Design an enzyme around this catalytic site. Structure first.
Site, PDB file in Angstrom:
ATOM      1  N   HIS C  37       0.823  -1.205   0.000  1.00  0.00           N
ATOM      2  CA  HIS C  37       0.000   0.000   0.000  1.00  0.00           C
ATOM      3  C   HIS C  37       0.860   1.260   0.000  1.00  0.00           C
ATOM      4  O   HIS C  37       0.360   2.365  -0.207  1.00  0.00           O
ATOM      5  CB  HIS C  37      -0.952   0.008   1.199  1.00  0.00           C
ATOM      6  CG  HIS C  37      -0.267   0.196   2.516  1.00  0.00           C
ATOM      7  ND1 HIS C  37       0.269  -0.852   3.232  1.00  0.00           N
ATOM      8  CD2 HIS C  37      -0.036   1.310   3.250  1.00  0.00           C
ATOM      9  CE1 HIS C  37       0.805  -0.392   4.349  1.00  0.00           C
ATOM     10  NE2 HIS C  37       0.633   0.917   4.384  1.00  0.00           N
ATOM     11  N   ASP C  87      -1.091  -7.780   1.557  1.00  0.00           N
ATOM     12  CA  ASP C  87      -0.405  -6.497   1.482  1.00  0.00           C
ATOM     13  C   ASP C  87       1.110  -6.676   1.497  1.00  0.00           C
ATOM     14  O   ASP C  87       1.781  -6.288   2.454  1.00  0.00           O
ATOM     15  CB  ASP C  87      -0.841  -5.601   2.644  1.00  0.00           C
ATOM     16  CG  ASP C  87      -0.310  -4.187   2.523  1.00  0.00           C
ATOM     17  OD1 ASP C  87       0.194  -3.829   1.439  1.00  0.00           O
ATOM     18  OD2 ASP C  87      -0.396  -3.435   3.516  1.00  0.00           O
ATOM     19  N   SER C 210       5.299   1.532   8.861  1.00  0.00           N
ATOM     20  CA  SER C 210       4.533   0.694   7.946  1.00  0.00           C
ATOM     21  C   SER C 210       5.447  -0.060   6.984  1.00  0.00           C
ATOM     22  O   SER C 210       6.405   0.501   6.455  1.00  0.00           O
ATOM     23  CB  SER C 210       3.524   1.537   7.164  1.00  0.00           C
ATOM     24  OG  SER C 210       2.754   0.730   6.290  1.00  0.00           O
TER      25      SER C 210
END
Ligand SMILES: *[C@@H]1O[C@H](CO)[C@@H](O)[C@H](O)[C@H]1NC(C)=O
Lengths: 240, 640, 277, 240, 93
Positions: C37, C87, C210
């Site tokens: 992402h 992801d 992240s």
């Protein structure tokens, strides 16, 4: 184990439902066996006496048994690594005999005691190997180090609070013994505020019948509308 | 003018399907019905909406079932309600019903009843709905110490686990001895919390058990013979015990114990049994009260102790709670309705029991009023009487005694109750009684429900049918009609008892007509009937071996299991020696139905003060378009 | 002090500003595992820079390989704006990395290299490793966070035991997931739930963290088993740490044991020796 | 708009009156003006004395529209626009108010929009004397009503730290409504206390981040205590 | 009372316990059991259950931090490895 096992079953059917079955007992016995009974815990370095009872449930047949206590460095009996402390007795039919055993737990922890016995002129034998705890000589104490209260902003600074805790005394601690420290946290309400609501018994007059012109109607309708509204939220239609 | 009625349980449950009975009296043609359920307060739509049409072919009866969420909007104190609305074309009939956030039941099973500091507690949780069926839900589990302070909290989910949550808790070596507790509850119902206790203590499994059973389950005051107690002691493997016993008695006042040092005996236990007698002399010498009638109400406790001849084991037993009553029996009208019908027969559900609480078998009972009218008590401990009533509105008083022979009148039991007249709408004297042959009902048999009517012939021809409903575990099991032609004062309803009615079920029947002067009257009646409490299906566990002899320590044995198909069976073997130190908190089918029964939305055993009272006391809310609606229910549990 | 050679810092420049700040993990001499992402189909290769070993310069990438099953916008129909299923993404560099005391790969599940790290027999199947690294209990793992331009470790716990359901259902408090019918649809089996208050107060992941590696420190070795995907409650706003974090502030990751077929294929020419299974 | 949860209210009537106030009686400024004052000047409550007629009336009508916004959101399409217009007006003159009453009625109107921040929010709180009442020299109707609007504003701002003193003042004044010209006081004092029974908390923020580190241990031991997980015995043992 | 060559034995944990290692083990010619040691752990301790190797006897149910466990072989057998293992910081004995 020589006893009666009580098995319990519980069914869980997606169709029928839940239902617990009736206890099904299962008796497990033996003609000749040893019932070795040891205390929950024995103090180290203290000479105690365990009792090994040999049962003989043979209807009419005496037995010549030769029970023995195996050696164990953890204990101090009359049985060494080269000697066998064993007796030779004759148990009468339909009876039992208690065989005394004096030992001395030399080291702490969960130790092991085992006794075997065989009969003469027969192919019968049995043995028991159970364990018993060895509580270190002394007494169980629990020195309360401290009981601090946690609440920043009140006894803290910049939002944080530091609280030192000195080690326990343990000055009179028994030589060669372990010990743990149980730190403990716990929240505590603190559950306050919330004010009481006006009793509905005080509103037995707000029920006015709406009437009048375009303005008087609303004036007489207001006391009733807001009244019911307040009673619906406070749920006080009970005392009203 | 038409009349659109509606009947729903007094308390609706979340995450379940509540039945909703729609009706119309009388009207013609098809009448569309749109049921809409909102929250409360405020008309915050919408919870559940259903639709149906009332066709004359079905005698104008609807059958809609909605499922109330769940929902996180239902979160402390006070109660929560929902506005149940039902539109019949144009005429709207709405009635607010109480809500029980309850999701279902939770049963906790522990492998043992007592544990030693260091072992692990194996326990499972069963997640079932109000119908006792496997259901995937989220449950909060806490474990409180003897000081009632949670030491462990979790949040499992029986989802895809068939409603069985296997768990365990390790007991630290250094732990606080006492009565621990395992509390659990659904995440959607933090108020409904179930609990199961287990004792933690340092102990050792004995080699034999000691039982103490007195000759009688009670004690008669003027009994000169005294209290004889039997001392049965045998090993855990069946064999008998040879030793000596140490027995002592004592009187137990209100949460108080006064030991009797004088009542100490030493009876030899030969052939695995003994015998001790408590002289009436010592008993009176114990207390400092001359009069013996003062001991009436208290109890006695026995404390025996068996010791082998080898002095290797020593077991301590006890039998507390020995009622010292004057009458070997008791009478309770708890199963008898508190309302009667002027003129119509009044049935009584006499509940004769023993001083301890166990049902009495075959016990002649009668009323002070009329003689000869007797009925021997059945097996469950329930008798069947039926006295007559006067058309007067005077409160009814009944005094039932026990005509048990071999016993003087001064040693019998008596109990007096009181019933109130059934108010009639407009004093038209229109009543309705439901007599049922009192017999121990069993799933698979048949029951005969009687419908006795009482009214003048001025409007008796208008009564062409009745409306009976089946209440079961707080829901509507079945609802139908009962045809009736003018002239029939008593009809019979062929009711088929299945496995659903278990444990008990209520039956409410009502009839509507136009009496007086265009006035719509409603008359109903309810009756509570108990069925043989047993497993929904079946589950038996016997031996797979061909009988033979007794197994040998370390031998294989076949374990036959006769259970239901597609059912998951969880086993657990426990040494009987464990039940010697503690036999409490044992999971039993009797306790399962016990919790379910003590959760019914009904309170009154039958009948009410009026028509709107019969429904509320049974667990239903009748509301029509004419104006006749049942009483409002705010409190979740039953009054008092 | 630089005890995280595998650690990688990713930055993506976009119009106006952008500067998408993510992190990865060196898994080979070319590829660097990271979130998916953090990138988009629009972002080119000249707008994506990756820095490792704390080097001041930026390494030029070749191509970013996304997971064949990655579709963040494949749930808008059900009213689900975000969908971080699968992801994961690899970044094949243009130049070969010379391993040093600042740059070094990290063990990936089901590899002959990891088998030795766990000291297990060569006859160890892929299934056996998953039982060793990810048991049915409260696993003790950790991730790399960046505080004040300085890397730091954050020990956490993977809710893979009976506390798994409790940690997953807390995904309802997440932005956009407040109106999800079935919570089990937004949390696919390809997720490893961490963070919370039980058994301990685990540190939460930030926005810059992240794509960070979910490592399990065992036998003095570092094994990556997950990839930081998304969090329930944002506790980092480039100012200070929340400090007042909710009891439902959970962190979700991507179980590598679920994306093995994709890793084994894209890394077939890296001499990592993936197990058959 | 409040009786919609009690009885059946025709949307054509409710939204009809709303559309009229917007299109007809509202200038480009977003201000509402009175053309035909009601005969009963006692039913208007704190609007009888008009030192700031513009701010007061505009706030009164505005609040009524926002209470019917959820209903007339389908029919009236110019409602959101009107709500914003009136908002821009009140926010531009809220720092110039003098009467504690106007500050309360206008503050609650801006609170529903969340546009009561900074200096405006500061003035609203400081206006209250003794931090428990928005009183003005004269009458009682103008006092209780004002404090009511302020209470609804505090509950709207979720500032339950300043609410207790206010709610306590109302209950400790014992005003069960009813009487002459008690139309406004009654409808508001019970609307605020009823809304308070729903938004009323139960305790105080319980979120302790207690982290203890031991000399014989590398990493720290961090624990958080919340309201739900309170009264929990979190223990840690250490043999050293 | 004794296991000959090529004799097989199986292990199975109770409800709520996970079984790690080899469930089925066969007695080999080298007087040893095939596969790894069977251990039934619930995963409630700081460190995983050390388990009880075939022929040994573990003393200590507590698997907290700093806790320890002792092992003892049968009569006539020589204990190989450690007789005492302490649960060190970082989840490792
Ligand atoms: C300390 O331990 C003993 C043993 O259980 C107990 O009697 C005593 O109450 C304990 N004291 C505290 C502070 O709990």
């Amino acid at each position: 184990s020589i006893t009666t096992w009580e098995i319990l079953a519980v069914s869980m059917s997606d169709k029928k439902g839940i239902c617990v079955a009736d206890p099904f007992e299962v008796t497990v016995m033996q003609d000749f066996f040893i019932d070795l009974r040891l205390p929950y815990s024995v103090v180290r370095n203290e000479q105690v006496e365990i009792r090994a009872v040999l049962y003989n449930y043979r209807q009419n047949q005496e037995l010549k048994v030769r029970v023995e206590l195996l050696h164990n460095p953890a204990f101090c009996s009359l049985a060494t690594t080269k000697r066998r402390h064993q007796q030779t007795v004759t148990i009468p039919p339909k009876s039992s005999l208690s065989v005394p055993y004096v030992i001395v737990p030399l080291k702490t922890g969960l130790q092991e005691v085992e006794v075997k016995a065989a009969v003469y002129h027969h192919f019968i034998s049995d043995g028991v190997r159970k364990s018993l705890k060895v509580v270190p000589e002394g007494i169980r104490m629990n020195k309360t180090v401290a009981v601090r209260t946690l609440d920043p902003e009140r006894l803290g600074r910049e939002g944080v609070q530091k609280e030192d805790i000195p080690p326990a005394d343990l000055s009179d601690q028994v030589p060669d013994t372990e010990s743990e420290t149980r730190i403990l946290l716990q929240g505590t309400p603190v559950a306050q505020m919330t004010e009481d609501a006006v009793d509905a018994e005080r509103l037995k007059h707000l029920i006015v019948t709406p009437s009048g012109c375009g303005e008087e109607n609303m004036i007489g309708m207001t006391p009733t509308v807001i009244a019911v509204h307040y009673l619906d939220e406070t749920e006080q239609w009970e005392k009203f | 003018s038409p009349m659109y009625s509606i009947i729903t349980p007094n308390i609706l449950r979340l995450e379940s399907e509540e039945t909703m009975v729609l009706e119309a009296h009388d009207a013609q043609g098809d009448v569309p019905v749109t049921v809409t359920v909102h929250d409360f307060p405020g008309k915050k739509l919408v919870l559940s909406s259903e639709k149906t049409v009332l066709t004359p072919a079905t005698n104008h009866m609807g059958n809609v079932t909605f499922t109330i969420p769940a929902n996180r909007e239902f979160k402390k104190g006070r109660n929560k309600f929902v506005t149940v609305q039902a539109t019949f074309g144009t005429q709207v009939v709405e009635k607010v019903v109480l809500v029980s956030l309850q999701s279902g039941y939770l049963f906790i099973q522990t492998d043992k009843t007592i544990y030693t500091p260091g072992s692990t507690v194996l326990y499972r949780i069963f997640t079932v709905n109000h119908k006792l069926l496997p259901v995937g839900r989220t449950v909060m589990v806490n474990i409180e110490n003897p000081e009632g302070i949670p030491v462990k909290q979790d949040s499992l989910s029986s989802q895809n686990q068939l409603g069985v949550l296997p768990l365990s808790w390790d007991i630290p070596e250094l732990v606080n001895m006492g009565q621990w507790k395992i509390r659990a509850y659904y995440e959607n119902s933090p108020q409904q919390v179930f609990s199961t206790e287990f004792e933690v203590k340092e102990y050792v499994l004995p080699s034999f058990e000691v039982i103490v059973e007195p000759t009688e389950k009670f004690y008669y005051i003027y009994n000169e013979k005294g209290l004889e107690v039997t001392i049965t002691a045998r090993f855990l493997y069946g064999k008998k015990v040879e030793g000596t016993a140490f027995v002592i008695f004592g009187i137990q006042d209100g949460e108080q114990r006064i030991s009797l040092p004088e009542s100490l005996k030493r009876i030899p236990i030969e052939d695995g049994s003994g015998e001790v007698v408590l002289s009436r002399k010592v008993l009176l010498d114990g207390v400092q009260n001359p009069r013996a009638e003062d001991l009436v109400g208290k109890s006695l406790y026995v404390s025996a102790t068996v010791i082998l001849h080898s002095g290797s084991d020593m077991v301590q037993a006890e039998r507390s709670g020995i009622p010292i009553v004057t009458s070997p029996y008791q009478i309770h009208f708890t199963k008898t309705p508190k309302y009667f019908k002027p003129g119509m027969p009044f049935d009584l559900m006499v509940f004769v029991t023993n001083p301890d609480g166990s049902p009495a078998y075959r016990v002649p009972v009668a009323v002070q009023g009329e003689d000869t009218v007797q009925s021997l008590t059945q097996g469950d401990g329930v008798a069947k009487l039926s006295i007559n009533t006067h058309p007067s509105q005077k409160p009814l008083s009944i005094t039932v005694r026990t005509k048990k022979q071999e016993l003087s009148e001064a040693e019998q039991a008596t109990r007096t109750m009181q019933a109130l007249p059934y108010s009639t709408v407009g004093n038209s004297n229109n009543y309705l009684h439901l007599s049922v042959l009192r017999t121990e009902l069993r799933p698979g048999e048949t029951l005969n429900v009687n419908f006795l009517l009482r009214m003048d012939r001025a409007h008796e021809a208008k009564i062409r049918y009745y409306t009976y409903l089946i209440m079961n575990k707080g829901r509507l099991l079945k609802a139908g009609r009962q045809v009736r032609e003018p002239g029939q004062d008593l009809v019979v309803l062929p009711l088929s008892i299945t496995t659903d009615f278990i444990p008990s079920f209520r039956l409410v029947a009502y009839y509507t007509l136009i009496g007086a002067s265009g006035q719509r009257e409603v008359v109903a009646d309810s009756v509570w009937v108990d069925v043989k409490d047993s497993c929904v299906g079946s589950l038996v566990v016997k031996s797979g071996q061909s009988e033979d002899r007794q197994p040998v320590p370390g031998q294989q044995m076949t374990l036959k299991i006769e259970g239901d198909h597609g059912a998951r069976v969880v086993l657990v073997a426990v040494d009987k020696g464990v039940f010697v130190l503690n036999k409490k908190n044992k999971l039993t089918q009797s306790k399962i139905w016990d919790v379910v029964e003590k959760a019914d939305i009904g309170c009154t055993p039958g009948s009410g003060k009026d028509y709107a009272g019969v429904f509320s006391d049974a667990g239903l809310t009748f509301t029509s378009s004419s104006g006749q609606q049942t009483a409002q229910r705010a409190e979740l549990q039953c009054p008092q | 002090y630089h005890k995280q050679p595998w650690q990688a810092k990713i930055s993506v420049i976009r119009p106006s500003k952008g500067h998408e700040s993510c992190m990865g993990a060196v898994v080979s001499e070319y590829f660097v595992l990271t979130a998916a992402h953090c990138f988009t189909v629009d972002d080119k290769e000249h707008s994506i820079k990756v820095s490792v070993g704390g080097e001041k310069r930026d390494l030029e990438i070749e191509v970013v390989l996304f997971h064949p099953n990655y579709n963040i916008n494949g749930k808008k129909e059900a009213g689900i704006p975000e969908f971080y299923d699968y992801d994961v993404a690899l970044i094949k560099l243009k130049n070969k990395l010379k391993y040093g005391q600042t740059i070094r790969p990290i063990c990936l599940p089901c590899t002959e290299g990891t088998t030795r790290a766990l000291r297990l027999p060569p006859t160890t199947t892929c299934q056996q490793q998953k039982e060793e690294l990810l048991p049915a209990q409260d696993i003790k793992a950790l991730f790399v966070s960046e505080e004040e331009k300085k890397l730091t470790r954050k020990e956490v716990y993977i809710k893979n035991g009976d506390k798994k359901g409790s940690c997953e259902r807390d995904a309802q408090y997440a932005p956009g997931y407040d109106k999800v019918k079935d919570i089990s649809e937004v949390v696919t089996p390809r997720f490893l739930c961490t963070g919370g208050v039980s058994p301990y107060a685990d540190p939460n992941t930030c926005r810059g963290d992240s794509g960070g590696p979910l490592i399990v420190h065992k036998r003095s070795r570092f094994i990556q088993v997950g990839v930081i995907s998304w969090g329930v409650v944002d506790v980092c706003k480039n100012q200070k740490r929340q400090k007042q974090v909710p009891a439902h502030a959970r962190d979700f990751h991507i179980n590598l044991f679920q994306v093995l077929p994709w890793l084994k294929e894209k890394l077939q020419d890296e001499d990592l020796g993936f197990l058959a299974a | 708009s409040l009786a919609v949860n009690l009885i059946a209210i025709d949307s054509q009537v409710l939204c009809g009156a709303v559309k009229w106030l917007i299109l007809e009686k509202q200038k480009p400024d977003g201000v509402f003006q009175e053309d035909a004052p009601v005969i009963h000047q006692e039913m208007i409550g704190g609007l009888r004395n008009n030192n700031e007629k513009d701010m007061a009336l505009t706030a009164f009508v505005l609040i009524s529209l926002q209470e019917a916004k959820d209903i007339c959101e389908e029919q009236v399409n110019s409602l959101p626009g009107s709500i914003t217009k009136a908002g821009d007006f009140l926010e531009a003159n809220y720092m110039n108010l003098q009467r504690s009453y106007t500050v309360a009625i206008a503050g609650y109107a801006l609170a529903q929009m969340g546009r009561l921040k900074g200096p405006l929010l500061n003035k609203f709180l400081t206006t209250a004397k003794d931090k428990n009442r928005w009183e003005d020299p004269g009458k009682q109707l103008y006092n209780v009503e004002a404090t009511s609007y302020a209470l609804l504003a505090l509950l709207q701002l979720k500032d339950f730290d300043f609410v207790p003193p206010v709610v306590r003042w109302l209950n400790e004044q014992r005003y069960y409504g009813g009487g002459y010209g008690s139309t406004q006081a009654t409808f508001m004092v019970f609307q605020a206390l009823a809304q308070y029974q729903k938004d009323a908390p139960d305790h105080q923020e319980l979120n302790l981040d207690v982290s203890l580190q031991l000399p014989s241990r590398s990493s720290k031991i961090t624990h958080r205590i919340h309201w739900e997980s309170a009264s929990l015995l979190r223990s840690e043992e250490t043999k050293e | 009372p004794y296991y000959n060559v090529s004799d097989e034995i199986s292990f199975h944990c109770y409800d709520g316990y996970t079984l790690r290692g080899s469930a089925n083990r066969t007695c080999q010619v080298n007087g040893r059991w095939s596969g790894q040691t069977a251990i039934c752990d619930n995963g409630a301790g700081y460190c995983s259950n050390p388990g009880i190797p075939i022929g040994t006897r573990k003393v200590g149910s507590q698997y907290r931090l700093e806790d320890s466990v002792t092992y003892h072989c049968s009569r006539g057998l020589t204990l190989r490895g450690s007789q005492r293992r302490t649960c060190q910081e970082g989840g490792s004995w």
